[PDB]
Symmetry: D4
Subunit: 256 residues, 8 copies
């Protein structure tokens, strides 16, 4: 029976699906690189992680560049809505799509690397220790760092990201050539990972951090995912919003 295409032809359904697909592709590539690094030694490195995340963002921008802007980031959506560039009524649709895409990407990565995870871990799913595999999906605070240092790191990283994102795609200034923005955005993400990544895991995206943590909690890693490192789970959800807003307002006041 036809006529279901009427629903799939609305103006908000298309943007919801675009956000879903772009976030799914980006997260699959990024989490795959992270799993490569964690599990194997001859098939993984940090530069591989950076390349995977950055040039997954590139492919996401290609997938959903024109339909919805390819935010792929809840902090970016909040910053754009709060500066008047996007109406406030599009926030829930984008956030829901990004969260569903990230959750399903985590499930995909879990299914693809199952045997390797079991062989590496010894059969026990641990959040901490020498055989911890909960770091593949979410980000946990390092040994020497404290909570507020991580808050500062997340805020500053997201501010830098938003400043450069505004600078690249501004047509009244010196922008990237139309049709070549995806490469430059991927390079920006790669070098954010390269330069400022060891302190917190640079989970500068709430969608990159929370839905995978919920998946790891459900799939059998325990309740220690939320209470590890003095309840670290809420820093990557709050710090990026403030960072992105401050970076955007700085660029608009000074350079724009």
């Amino acid at each position: 029976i036809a006529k279901i295409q009427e629903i799939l032809q609305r103006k908000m359904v298309r943007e919801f699906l675009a956000e879903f697909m772009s976030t799914y592709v980006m997260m699959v590539f990024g989490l795959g690189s992270v799993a490569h690094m964690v599990l194997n030694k001859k098939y993984g490195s940090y530069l591989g992680v950076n390349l995977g995340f950055g040039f997954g963002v590139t492919m996401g921008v290609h997938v959903a560049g024109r339909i919805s802007g390819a935010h792929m980031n809840a902090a970016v959506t909040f910053a754009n809505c709060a500066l008047g560039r996007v109406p406030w009524r599009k926030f829930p649709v984008y956030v829901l799509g990004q969260f569903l895409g990230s959750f399903l990407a985590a499930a995909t990565i879990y299914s693809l690397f199952y045997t390797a995870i079991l062989h590496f871990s010894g059969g026990q799913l641990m959040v901490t220790g020498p055989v911890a595999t909960a770091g593949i999906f979410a980000t946990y605070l390092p040994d020497h760092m404290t909570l507020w240092r991580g808050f500062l790191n997340e805020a500053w990283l997201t501010g830098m990201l938003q400043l450069c994102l505004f600078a690249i795609t501004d047509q009244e200034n010196n922008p990237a050539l139309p049709g070549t923005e995806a490469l430059v955005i991927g390079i920006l993400v790669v070098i954010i990972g390269v330069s400022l990544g060891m302190n917190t895991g640079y989970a500068i995206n709430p969608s990159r951090d929370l839905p995978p943590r919920i998946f790891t909690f459900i799939a059998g890693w325990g309740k220690q995912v939320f209470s590890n490192g003095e309840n670290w789970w809420w820093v990557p959800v709050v710090a990026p919003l403030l960072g992105a807003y401050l970076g955007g307002i700085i660029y608009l006041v000074f350079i724009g």
Copy 2:
């Protein structure tokens, strides 16, 4: 001679042959560098070689025939109405011949290092195995159906992103810079999802080199190794590519 060489079908066959040969030579050379030597090889080098060989192939034969260089991509394009069905045999034959000759060339250029490394013994399995240079073999901890799932999913992602990059109505790459983006896509497919199966997401990349290793003196264990794994990289990518293409067409397109 020039009269026959001017046929359009002959031109398309030659274009597919040359592009596939270039891509396979670069990829197999990188894999041989990694396996044989230690200070001259890395996994990142393998990814780079197999990724930008695709860019060079696209530059070689991107206009004459579209530069598929992949049986799964050709099957997906034909099954979705983009290419006539009558062009499947010629494209697949050209790709297979190019891959076979590239495998022979890599065997000829690296012969001394292969013999020096292996001790003179051509072994499919063991600490000095050299048959994995040309084809892909299942790792220690993997089963057959896990490998099937990996191959299908990786090919689906490749086809979805290929449709996204070269779509003129949607947000495409700038005409004249698409080869770079396709190469980067293949590079990150290798970087992110390649340890489980060797990402043999190409039937043309996997079968003809295996037949060459059977002929050249690696024995008949190339086919019976890993619970008869030889047929998975020939069947899974077709299904994966078809599903990825249909998903992109229905949802985004």
Copy 3:
């Protein structure tokens, strides 16, 4: 205060400040990654960080002021009659302020890691020296005049290639894609000729971080280490940049 912010000189000052801040933050972050951690850092990472920080700075402020981000490049442009001499102080002051604040930011973000690595003692030289994150110091086998030669030659190469990339009469990079090429140029300058002096081919990259380390508790040995090396990165790049520019203008132009 909107009227003052709309002035031309204020806009140029702010543009140079922001671009230099971005470039220095990325570069110093990569250097700190390399120095402190073992599995998260490499020389290639340092090269990539500095080069693509230059790229992002060019995108930020490449049209308001030219995105020099370099005192040697500004001096070379002014002395060859391309920029008025009256705009040298404003650009230099903006670059110095940006570099100082970038050093402060890198100090604040990596504080715990620095203390954990060193053990609480801030040492200019030794096996746990951390003063090399911010400025460049003479290696063990080098002398002072060899370092002078290295600095001058590297800055000359940089200036010649920079003139070549943006020359409209000659073969230039496609407008809108120049930032990538400049980033790649800086990346390969780091890769090819970087181990002899740390390629502090920018006076603004070298002096303000050194002043910050002097202020912040690394002591007065920052200026007196290596037989008063602090002035070579400030003097050699100006001569190198001028010679490279005049060579390009006479020969290729």
Copy 4:
């Protein structure tokens, strides 16, 4: 001198000289970084240095003379009717001068490091050999004719891909972005097929540095190591480039 400076032949000679110098400085610097140091050197760095040095040279002199930077490429172009035979000696002479001066510059910059690494003794073969920074020497297991085959095939692949990139009738790279694609081509040539012979696929990159090392105190063993290996990099690339060019012209063109 103006009257003896704006002539077309002098301009083309200067363009070739500058481009060859620029590319060779970066390539030899990366090779020296790899040989002398362990933490600051890698094979990927060598590949990147050579490829993007080619990119910068193409930017410097890509419109004045075509930026051949290669004696084999010039020979292939002249033999196919694209470039007149009267511009062969000037291009080759400029390339040789540029390569010789680039080798001299690299010797001057890395002098202290070379003396520290070798212990003071300049030797061609052994565990502390340093003559391989400038030229290419046959590795342990290989023989002469396998190396001849390697050089010929590598140069053929290079010439075929160079023809494909810049062909306007076929699918070319977008004008303004060809330098990046040529650099990536050289990078993957190094990554995939570079350990068997050192991929000195250039008569201008291999011989002038060898003559410099002979003059500068490395002895006459540079010309008699590995059964007079010196002449193979001079002769094999010409044949390889010619065959690759005609193959592309007949089949794809």
Copy 5:
């Protein structure tokens, strides 16, 4: 007063066997734990040295009171060949088992925090962070059950033949007062040259009581059901090996 009980002969022999086995097992298990847990503070040669020269101290402690067997297989071989009465087998074996159990408990007590830090809280028999192998011996990846049986039997036979040879007065013996060094060197080289196939648990007292302790102390019942029920081979093979080695030496050389 209980001085009458402590001045007997069987009580003295029981105490001597207990003390010698305790002294040997503490050193052996400490060396094994050093090897397994830390990297720069452990080596296979250190394991061999500890397990070999703990026997020297055991022989010094209980050499004259009871012969310092410290081994159930050696006791069985001596009783079967007519050198020890059959009524001394139970007391010797009981003392050796108690000493080995207490030595395992001591090594667990002294290395508690290091074990928890290495494993990461949990206690696993198998895996990359397994620590159950500090106390007992588990079969390697390649070996099968009967190959391990053959290894245990042959190693114990060699041990018994050399032990008979060293301490035989008619033949060429070691100088009295210097036999402990030679026996320690014998055990050291047995570990060095034949010790990787099974773990050279050629002593039932060295193998079973630590396994029982690990089962009780929270390692679970996988200690008994790992490697196709490997637990019974180190109890049955050494007896046959020791008897064969002794009879061969007596028939041929003696």
Copy 6:
């Protein structure tokens, strides 16, 4: 002053001083080798140095005073009635003076190596800590009341085996060969049970070197590190040695 040297008490004092000096010099030399140098140092070297230094001390002063070289051993022997209580102060004083002078000797002999390794800074804790050559400090995961138990048990084992080796009624070592067996006992004590606390089971081995480090410039952090660890390896060995001796006397003796 030849008469004063003939008195029995002075003879015993000098014997204890000399034997302790020899033992401590060998032990601290081995420990410094392990810490400062990488290829010349190992844990087995430390064990050998301490054990066979004990052997050499026994040979030096085994007859004049019994060759205790250990305050816990002296306390256990006096308490059980084998040595009069009037000889405890002189033995302890000689041992302490010998240990202090051996620490001074090792400090003088390895001075340049210590300065080169530490960078010139004497640090109790950190990646370049050198205070652990002279005394023992609590490890990473250990606590105080686990180290107490470790020290007591190790000293108990030492004393029990020492009683067993030198008992004439039981099975002793052949007279004239006891030093070898005592040295091997100390070697295996180090090998088997030494990593939890540094097996400093001796007041004389631990306190005087720590006092020397405090005086010589390591500061007051030697006494207050690890929750005031300085007193555990002075009170635990006494209890351990007493218990081990009484257990041997009651059960085996």
Copy 7:
């Protein structure tokens, strides 16, 4: 009865030589296999210790009945210098050869699974996974044949000189009952100091019978035609070396 023939002097001398050679070769080949196959359980010092201190156990087994030569070169040197009658040479050599052959067989049977796992199922004499060097000695890459001849001769000469020195009653000898440890230490330091050039096969019995076993067991005839027919140097060089070393000691120090 098989008890009257077994009591003849020339029969028990044969049995003593057979047993001592078997023990020594078992220990030595076990250590070599440990080094070759596994990386974390093997070292060069372990090889030295195993080979050196198997000699101690052999001496204790058969040091008084026959002299415990365990070496064809030592027997030849003793016979040629008049210390031993020439009629005992064949029986001693036969016993040593049988013992070495059976020790090679035992080492093959105990390490079978490990050998197959390491080599990949292919028995190879040359290559990165060559396992024929566990049993015999093969010429290194840069050495030539006559340099190996010189090395074998000189090492055997040093061994024989020091062996004469240790056991000379008129000179300064080792204390009786302690003469096995000193011989073991001599062999250990011969391995430690001069063993990397040729594998220090200073014993024809240590070299030829294991090579014959490897030829039979499936390593092929490349065991004999490797390194320009190197198999005969370790059989001929030690005899001359031992004779010269003994003569030097007798003339100068004796």
Copy 8:
């Protein structure tokens, strides 16, 4: 030829031959271990060097212990003669025998390890550098070490050696059981090498140091063997004599 065989029956010739042979054996074993360490990575270690140089002394003591005491050391002979234990008329013969034995041992080690030396070096014989091989036969000063520090090290090490040698073989005191002294002397030398032997190479023997240096000068390593490290060659010949004499005096006065 019995006319010349009467020469080999005199006491002085007997002692000369005993010293020659014992020094030869010791130096062969020690230099072989050092060459093993320097040339090869897997077949060499510092502990092997210590063991070889330590138990060569045991073998030499067994060879020539009754005839002359097996000094094998010029400092030991000087200390024994100066303190009144050996007549001064027997000093030159012992020293000459030790020097000849050490020279021939160096020649033997050079002949045995010739191909390995040439393969390691690359054909070039260098006193200093990353492929230096002159240090197999003699000792050279380290990088951070000075000259007077080396003098102090040599003196102290030889003093400890002499004190322990007096202690081990003292009949009135606690001696090693006769027939078992060689093992204890070997262990003494082993732990002297283990504990204190990295600052100077512990060339506590002039006979171990000078004749191999003369051989390396003659055999083609050049004249830099003497002028390397500010003329270091004379320290190992002067420091051990003073050290040994002081150690002997201290033992005889305080313990003896």
